[PDB]
């Protein structure tokens, strides 16, 4: 009866962005935290045994319920942008043919980065 882990759930909840890296690769970052999977696990736990998890935790899950697929798509955009920026870093003559396209795409990328806790223009960005 691992009820202490169920207490740890409450304690864990009781506990776009940008940050540095190591190879000077300022990757695109999401304002959220990797907790959507934990919220889904909480839902599984609730249907699993009927825990009396705090209503504040359930409401935080509902808060993330309206913005989590946007964050998953953001994470996919981040990882695929990494996947192809490494490919551009591979050679050098790529710039001579992709330059204007790079500038126009990166300007919209920065405009998408501009969202900080704003569900109004969060989706078009």
């Amino acid at each position: 009866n691992t009820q202490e882990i169920f207490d740890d759930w409450a304690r864990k909840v009781q506990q776009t962005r940008v940050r540095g890296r190591t190879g000077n690769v300022l990757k695109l970052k999401v304002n959220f935290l990797p907790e959507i999977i934990t919220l889904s696990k909480e839902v599984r736990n609730l249907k699993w045994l009927g825990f009396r998890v705090p209503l504040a935790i359930v409401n935080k899950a509902h808060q993330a319920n309206q913005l989590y697929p946007f964050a998953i798509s953001l994470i996919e955009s981040v990882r695929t942008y990494e996947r192809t920026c490494e490919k551009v870093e591979e050679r050098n003559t790529i710039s001579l043919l992709v330059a204007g396209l790079k500038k126009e795409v990166q300007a919209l990328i920065a405009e998408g980065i501009a969202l900080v806790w704003e569900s109004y223009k969060l989706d078009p960005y």
């Binding site: 300022l26 695109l28 920026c85 870093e89 790529i94 710039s95 920065a110 501009a114």
Partner: peptide
């Protein structure tokens, strides 16, 4: 023209 340093400029103090 730049490969990735343009994002290094639009992420240092962008938020």
């Amino acid at each position: 023209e730049q490969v990735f340093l343009m994002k290094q400029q639009s992420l240092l103090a962008k938020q």
